[PDB]
Design a protein around this motif. Structure first.
Motif, PDB file in Angstrom:
ATOM      1  N   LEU A  13       0.030 -17.905  10.150  1.00  0.00           N
ATOM      2  CA  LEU A  13      -1.179 -17.886  10.096  1.00  0.00           C
ATOM      3  C   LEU A  13      -2.093 -16.455   9.974  1.00  0.00           C
ATOM      4  N   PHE A  14      -1.536 -15.786  11.013  1.00  0.00           N
ATOM      5  CA  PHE A  14      -1.606 -14.191  10.941  1.00  0.00           C
ATOM      6  C   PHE A  14      -0.497 -13.381  10.494  1.00  0.00           C
ATOM      7  N   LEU A  15      -1.263 -12.645   9.070  1.00  0.00           N
ATOM      8  CA  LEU A  15       0.557 -11.726   8.912  1.00  0.00           C
ATOM      9  C   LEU A  15      -0.233 -10.032   9.088  1.00  0.00           C
ATOM     10  N   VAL A  16       0.498 -10.163   9.533  1.00  0.00           N
ATOM     11  CA  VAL A  16       0.387  -8.227   9.274  1.00  0.00           C
ATOM     12  C   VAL A  16       1.204  -7.567   8.933  1.00  0.00           C
ATOM     13  N   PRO A  17       0.242  -6.700   8.188  1.00  0.00           N
ATOM     14  CA  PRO A  17       1.343  -5.527   7.594  1.00  0.00           C
ATOM     15  C   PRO A  17       1.334  -4.229   7.944  1.00  0.00           C
ATOM     16  N   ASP A  18       2.859  -3.129   6.838  1.00  0.00           N
ATOM     17  CA  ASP A  18       2.281  -1.956   7.375  1.00  0.00           C
ATOM     18  C   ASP A  18       1.575  -1.421   5.787  1.00  0.00           C
ATOM     19  N   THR A  19       1.876   0.325   6.488  1.00  0.00           N
ATOM     20  CA  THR A  19       1.245   0.859   5.815  1.00  0.00           C
ATOM     21  C   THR A  19       1.981   0.902   4.255  1.00  0.00           C
ATOM     22  N   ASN A  20       3.280   1.212   3.906  1.00  0.00           N
ATOM     23  CA  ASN A  20       4.003   0.550   3.307  1.00  0.00           C
ATOM     24  C   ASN A  20       4.078  -0.643   2.216  1.00  0.00           C
ATOM     25  N   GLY A  21       3.254  -1.693   3.724  1.00  0.00           N
ATOM     26  CA  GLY A  21       3.466  -2.836   2.493  1.00  0.00           C
ATOM     27  C   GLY A  21       1.878  -2.681   1.664  1.00  0.00           C
ATOM     28  N   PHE A  22       0.539  -2.027   1.742  1.00  0.00           N
ATOM     29  CA  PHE A  22      -0.138  -1.578   0.537  1.00  0.00           C
ATOM     30  C   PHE A  22       0.470  -0.190  -0.222  1.00  0.00           C
ATOM     31  N   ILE A  23       1.039   0.510   0.151  1.00  0.00           N
ATOM     32  CA  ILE A  23       1.463   1.426  -0.729  1.00  0.00           C
ATOM     33  C   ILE A  23       2.899   0.773  -2.228  1.00  0.00           C
ATOM     34  N   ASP A  24       3.331  -0.304  -1.668  1.00  0.00           N
ATOM     35  CA  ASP A  24       4.615  -0.871  -2.501  1.00  0.00           C
ATOM     36  C   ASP A  24       4.163  -2.012  -3.058  1.00  0.00           C
ATOM     37  N   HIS A  25       2.702  -2.541  -2.766  1.00  0.00           N
ATOM     38  CA  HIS A  25       3.655  -4.060  -2.801  1.00  0.00           C
ATOM     39  C   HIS A  25       2.002  -4.528  -1.995  1.00  0.00           C
ATOM     40  N   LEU A  26       0.729  -3.785  -2.904  1.00  0.00           N
ATOM     41  CA  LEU A  26      -0.576  -4.525  -2.667  1.00  0.00           C
ATOM     42  C   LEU A  26      -1.481  -5.201  -3.640  1.00  0.00           C
ATOM     43  N   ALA A  27      -0.477  -5.842  -4.872  1.00  0.00           N
ATOM     44  CA  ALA A  27      -0.980  -7.049  -5.608  1.00  0.00           C
ATOM     45  C   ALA A  27      -0.049  -7.978  -4.906  1.00  0.00           C
ATOM     46  N   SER A  28       0.300  -8.220  -4.060  1.00  0.00           N
ATOM     47  CA  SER A  28       1.382  -9.806  -3.273  1.00  0.00           C
ATOM     48  C   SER A  28       0.564  -9.443  -2.023  1.00  0.00           C
ATOM     49  N   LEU A  29      -0.513  -8.400  -1.460  1.00  0.00           N
ATOM     50  CA  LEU A  29      -0.992  -8.573  -0.409  1.00  0.00           C
ATOM     51  C   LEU A  29      -2.263  -9.080  -0.474  1.00  0.00           C
ATOM     52  N   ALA A  30      -2.876  -9.105  -1.661  1.00  0.00           N
ATOM     53  CA  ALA A  30      -3.921 -10.031  -2.976  1.00  0.00           C
ATOM     54  C   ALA A  30      -3.469 -11.323  -3.069  1.00  0.00           C
ATOM     55  N   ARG A  31      -2.898 -11.545  -3.633  1.00  0.00           N
ATOM     56  CA  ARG A  31      -2.190 -12.935  -4.083  1.00  0.00           C
ATOM     57  C   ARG A  31      -2.479 -13.511  -2.213  1.00  0.00           C
ATOM     58  N   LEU A  32      -1.769 -12.520  -1.419  1.00  0.00           N
ATOM     59  CA  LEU A  32      -1.413 -13.795  -0.252  1.00  0.00           C
ATOM     60  C   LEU A  32      -3.472 -14.071   0.334  1.00  0.00           C
ATOM     61  N   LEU A  33      -3.614 -12.899   0.319  1.00  0.00           N
ATOM     62  CA  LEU A  33      -5.363 -13.208   0.340  1.00  0.00           C
ATOM     63  C   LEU A  33      -6.227 -13.769   0.043  1.00  0.00           C
ATOM     64  N   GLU A  34      -5.859 -13.763  -1.597  1.00  0.00           N
ATOM     65  CA  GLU A  34      -6.480 -14.837  -2.654  1.00  0.00           C
ATOM     66  C   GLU A  34      -6.068 -16.178  -2.500  1.00  0.00           C
ATOM     67  N   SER A  35      -5.311 -16.496  -1.751  1.00  0.00           N
ATOM     68  CA  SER A  35      -4.424 -18.110  -1.503  1.00  0.00           C
ATOM     69  C   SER A  35      -5.188 -18.709  -0.777  1.00  0.00           C
ATOM     70  N   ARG A  36      -5.925 -18.085   0.348  1.00  0.00           N
ATOM     71  CA  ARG A  36      -6.421 -18.553   1.789  1.00  0.00           C
ATOM     72  C   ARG A  36      -5.915 -19.142   3.010  1.00  0.00           C
ATOM     73  N   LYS A  37      -4.168 -19.560   2.467  1.00  0.00           N
ATOM     74  CA  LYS A  37      -3.130 -20.117   3.014  1.00  0.00           C
ATOM     75  C   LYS A  37      -3.493 -19.361   4.653  1.00  0.00           C
ATOM     76  N   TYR A  38      -3.734 -17.822   5.079  1.00  0.00           N
ATOM     77  CA  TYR A  38      -2.921 -17.187   6.187  1.00  0.00           C
ATOM     78  C   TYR A  38      -4.870 -15.884   5.962  1.00  0.00           C
ATOM     79  N   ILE A  39      -4.103 -15.773   7.425  1.00  0.00           N
ATOM     80  CA  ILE A  39      -5.300 -14.331   8.018  1.00  0.00           C
ATOM     81  C   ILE A  39      -4.424 -13.186   7.873  1.00  0.00           C
ATOM     82  N   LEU A  40      -4.830 -11.920   6.437  1.00  0.00           N
ATOM     83  CA  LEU A  40      -4.642 -10.739   6.773  1.00  0.00           C
ATOM     84  C   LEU A  40      -5.096 -10.238   7.448  1.00  0.00           C
TER      85      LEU A  40
END
Length: 170
Positions: A13-40
């Motif tokens: 339910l709760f997903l916790v990224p590191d800094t590299n996750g934003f640098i390398d994978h912002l689009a994926s993090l955005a897709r996860l947030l847009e899903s509404r299935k998870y709390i980032l």
């Protein structure tokens, strides 16, 4: 009984990224947030790292641009009061606003792990069955970093790289 060991009931339910996750994978993090299935849940220390990167030529320029895009994304979503995005400080307080944010006050790695651990407070009674000794884990640390991954594994925090999580989450 054979000797007892703890097991994890893993229900993300709760997903916790590191800094590299934003640098390398912002689009994926955005897709996860847009899903509404998870709390980032973004550690305040990660936001602090991104702000420092954001402020060049060369590699410095590259990372600066990526950090600026990450901050612009986070600030926009927090200002829109996105119900699936939170920030957490080292001392366990959840932020619904990151305007005028402070530096989180023992590594930066330890702070990210403590953020994850905020979601696995186990009580003494959770270890007593009436069977598997099994404990609920609703948090996942999203990272590609070997150091953090091993920290998480040894501290009972479910852990996955962003690309594989996104695929698994469908």
């Amino acid at each position: 009984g054979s000797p007892e060991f703890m097991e994890l009931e893993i229900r993300p339910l709760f997903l916790v990224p590191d800094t590299n996750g934003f640098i390398d994978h912002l689009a994926s993090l955005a897709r996860l947030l847009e899903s509404r299935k998870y709390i980032l849940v973004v550690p305040l220390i990660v936001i602090n790292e991104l702000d420092g990167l954001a402020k060049a030529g060369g590699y410095a320029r590259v990372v600066q641009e990526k950090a600026r895009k990450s901050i612009e994304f986070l600030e926009q979503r927090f200002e829109s009061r996105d119900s699936c995005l939170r920030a957490l400080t080292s001392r366990g307080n959840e932020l619904e606003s990151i305007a005028f944010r402070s530096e989180d006050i023992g590594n930066n790695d330890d702070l990210i792990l403590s953020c994850c651990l905020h979601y696995c407070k186990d009580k003494a009674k959770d270890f007593m069955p009436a069977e598997p000794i099994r404990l609920l884990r609703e948090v996942v640390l999203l990272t590609d970093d070997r150091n953090l991954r091993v920290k998480a594994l040894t501290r009972n925090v479910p852990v996955r790289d962003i690309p594989a999580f996104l695929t698994w989450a469908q």
